[PDB]
């Protein structure tokens, strides 16, 4: 499903080769929301600073994982005005990665602490988006959903597809079932197995 | 939105040049509409920007309290009053459609400045 | 207000030169510097809202450049309709700074 849907425009990836991930399973996978513009995308992907890279999320030069991002004109694009994103632009220190800030502070430009109600040097650090499709490219939004791969020390339980193929019958194959190789014909057998065990 | 500015006044001191930025267009609000000094013999500077709904009265150094900037309920017209006419204080005064907050319709944070006075 | 300073008058070239109009600063901020155009007795105009972004209405010419100390603008192909004084944006007060820009 990553790889067909050509709308899915980013495809480049950092840590490892996308239609190489249907072996080596990991622990877990995550999944997130990310609503940009069109200026962001480049600025969420290693490597590169930016207005949203430093301020919202600051993602690692080297990490296993990548994003992949679509055209939204037709989804999250509303003619009325779609005002219920925001994000932060006034961090005072620079950003450590893998975390979330929901603080409703005020954010002040001047020594003292300004506080209250907003104004010149007083400004609330969430801004509000607006994504109506009359706009031109580099404010469309592009949805962005980033992976994550780990192999912490627990038994691996996220895979990809299993190649099953067909059942050969009186012929002499090398069978791989569930993993275990060998080398032999296949008959029909009329031994009564348990449902608790898999081999004889 | 377009801001247009008044015609000056008489050159002679003792007293009290005014000024009025008109911005046609685009009834908007909290974004301050900053004005600055220009000459070919001198610098710019920051001389007060003006919200409408607010109307916080921040200014810069060496000319607090001889400058008065004022507007109406909401976007319209904007008034500044200047008394002490003096020698090195005469320039052209250029109002801005400055980027920064905004608590009106939530939109742009980065609008886009698009609008001068002709100059007077 | 703390005091800065910005590029010499003194940069003449000819026509697909790059220049180096310089603006020294002295606070670590980003999107708070700006490049600003004026024209000597003509409307003004904007160059750049910041380093890392631009304005819809601007030939590709001028560019920004730097995030430290000092932020420096420089023009791809310079043509003799670029005669302008430009100046530069810092803080929060914002203490603007002199600049004349002419080929010579």
């Known amino acids: 499903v990553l790889y067909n849907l050509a709308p899915f425009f980013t495809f480049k990836c950092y840590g490892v080769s996308p239609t190489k991930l249907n072996d080596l399973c990991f622990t877990n996978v995550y999944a997130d929301s990310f609503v940009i513009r069109g200026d962001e995308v480049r600025q969420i992907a290693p490597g590169q600073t930016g207005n949203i890279a430093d301020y919202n999320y600051k993602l690692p030069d080297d990490f296993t994982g990548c994003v992949i991002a679509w055209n939204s004109n037709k989804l999250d694009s509303k003619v009325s005005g779609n005002y219920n994103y925001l994000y932060r632009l006034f961090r005072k220190s620079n950003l450590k990665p893998f975390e979330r800030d929901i603080s409703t502070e005020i954010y002040q430009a001047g020594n003292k602490p300004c506080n209250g109600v907003a104004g010149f040097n007083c400004y609330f650090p969430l801004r509000s988006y607006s994504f109506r499709p009359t706009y031109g490219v580099g404010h469309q939004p592009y949805r962005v959903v980033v992976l994550s791969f780990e192999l912490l020390h627990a038994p691996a339980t996220v895979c990809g597809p299993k190649k099953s193929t067909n059942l050969v019958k009186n012929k002499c194959v090398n069978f791989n079932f569930n993993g275990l190789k060998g080398t032999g014909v296949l008959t029909e057998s009329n031994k009564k197995f348990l449902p608790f065990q898999q081999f004889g | 939105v377009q801001l247009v500015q008044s015609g000056a006044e008489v050159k002679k001191p003792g007293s009290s040049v005014k000024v009025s930025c008109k911005a046609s267009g685009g009834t908007f609000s909290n974004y301050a509409l900053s004005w600055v000094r220009q000459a070919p013999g001198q610098g710019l500077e920051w001389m007060g920007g003006?919200?409408?709904?607010?109307?916080?009265?921040n200014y810069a150094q060496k000319f607090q309290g001889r400058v008065t900037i004022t507007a109406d309920e909401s976007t319209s017209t904007a008034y500044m009053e200047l008394s002490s006419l003096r020698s090195e204080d005469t320039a052209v005064y250029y109002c801005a459609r400055l980027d920064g907050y905004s608590f009106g319709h939530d939109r742009y944070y980065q609008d886009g400045m698009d609008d001068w006075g002709p100059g007077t | 207000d703390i005091q800065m300073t910005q590029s010499p008058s003194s940069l003449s070239a000819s026509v697909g030169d790059r220049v180096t109009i310089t603006c020294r600063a002295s606070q670590a901020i980003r999107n708070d510097l700006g490049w600003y155009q004026q024209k000597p007795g003509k409307a003004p105009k904007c160059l750049i809202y910041?380093?890392?972004s631009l304005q819809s209405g601007v030939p590709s010419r001028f560019s920004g450049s730097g995030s430290g100390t000092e932020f420096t603008l420089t023009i791809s192909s310079l043509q003799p309709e670029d005669f302008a004084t430009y100046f530069c944006?810092?803080?929060?007060?914002?203490?603007?700074?002199f600049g004349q820009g002419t080929k010579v």
């Open positions: 910041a380093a890392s």
């Open positions: 003006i919200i409408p709904i607010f109307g916080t009265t």
């Open positions: 944006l810092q803080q929060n007060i914002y203490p603007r700074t």
